[PDB]
Amino acid sequence: MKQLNIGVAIYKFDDTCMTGVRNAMTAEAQGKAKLNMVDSQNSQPTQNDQVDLFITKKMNALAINPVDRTAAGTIIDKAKQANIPVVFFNREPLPEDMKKWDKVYYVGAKAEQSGILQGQIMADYWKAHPEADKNHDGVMQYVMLMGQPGHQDAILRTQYSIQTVKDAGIKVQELAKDYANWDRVTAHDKMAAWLSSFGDKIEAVFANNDDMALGAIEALKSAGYFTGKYIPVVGVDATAPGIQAIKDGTLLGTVLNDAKNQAKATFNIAYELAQGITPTKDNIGYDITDGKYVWIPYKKITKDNISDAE
Ligand SMILES: *CC(=O)c1ccc2cc(N(C)C)ccc2c1
Ligand SMILES: OC[C@H]1O[C@@H](O)[C@H](O)[C@@H](O)[C@@H]1O
Ligand SMILES: [Ca+2]
Ligand SMILES: [Cl-]
Ligand SMILES: [Cl-]
Ligand SMILES: [K+]
């Protein structure tokens, strides 16, 4: 067969979710196309250099997980000039940037949905457990661990999780919120400081992803929770360690971020484009929305259906 080369840039390799995505992409590509996969080390200048090299090396298609998703416009400019099609994934280009060229696609998921499902987990717990309102004021005191500033999943999961709790008829009070950039250790450090400041005032913890929820859980353990003393913590992704924390009883719930189907859709699009074929639902195996987007559903995960994540 003809060798097809796809340039793949991952925003950083030390991201738990994106490790799942790139491993699944590598599995899908086996026997079909050569992935030239690089680590952008959470640096857009690094990724810009990598994209330039992909283009110089005449990749047949690009699959880019952009560090700064607002940089997708400049990446599209370069790709258009080189006539190399590009699919973006997981970090979403701005909608007007997507209209710059007709060989540009995006694969991801509707972050609003993951926020809603998060909020439902917490609201349902709150309604079933009167003891959760530790200061008996009829208000849920919570803290919020956000992802990276400006990332669409951080913006939308933060907004929709809490709006969903309010929509469920529950009054809320935000004690603290901060960016922990999807990182376990940073979330741990933020949560530890909050526990020193506010202590038993905290009644609920929301995190935009599992790694941050897990860091929060470690700070909570250190402060005496989850032995004997309980607090509900919710995340997003249903990674292997997230699933383990659900089983341990330390994570109340999460939302499956379907890396396997996002990887398949991304690969399939890049593979068709590498062959000079326009993606269709028939030839990539997924619905295409607004001519450019493939949205993969999120799914609620608690101890009640932990096998749905496995
Ligand atoms: C990218 C993402 O969110 C995600 C979700 C789940 C997930 C699970 C696993 N295993 C169960 C091994 C690996 C990666 C992964 C990533
Ligand atoms: O872009 C990276 C981020 O993507 C999000 O969709 C995932 O939930 C996070 O775990 C990940 O760090
Ligand atoms: Ca309260
Ligand atoms: Cl930690
Ligand atoms: Cl799917
Ligand atoms: K406990």
Author numbering: 1 to 228, 230 to 311
What's written in the study?
We installed thiol-reactive derivatives of the naphthalene-based fluorophore Prodan into bacterial periplasmic glucose-binding proteins. Glucose is bound at the interface between two domains of ecGBP.
In the ecGBP.W183C•Acrylodan glucose complex, the ground-state carbonyl is coplanar with the naphthalene ring and emits a green color when excited, whereas in the ttGBP.F17C•Badan glucose complex it has twisted ~30° out of plane, and emits a blue color upon excitation. In ttGBP.F17C•Badan, the carbonyl hole is formed by D238 and N258. N258 is located on one of the hinge strands, and forms a hydrogen bond with the glucose 1-hydroxyl. Each conjugate protrudes through a different channel, located in different parts of the interface, ~120° apart. By contrast, the dimethyl amino (DMA) groups of the fluorophores in these two structures point into solution and are isolated from the surrounding protein.
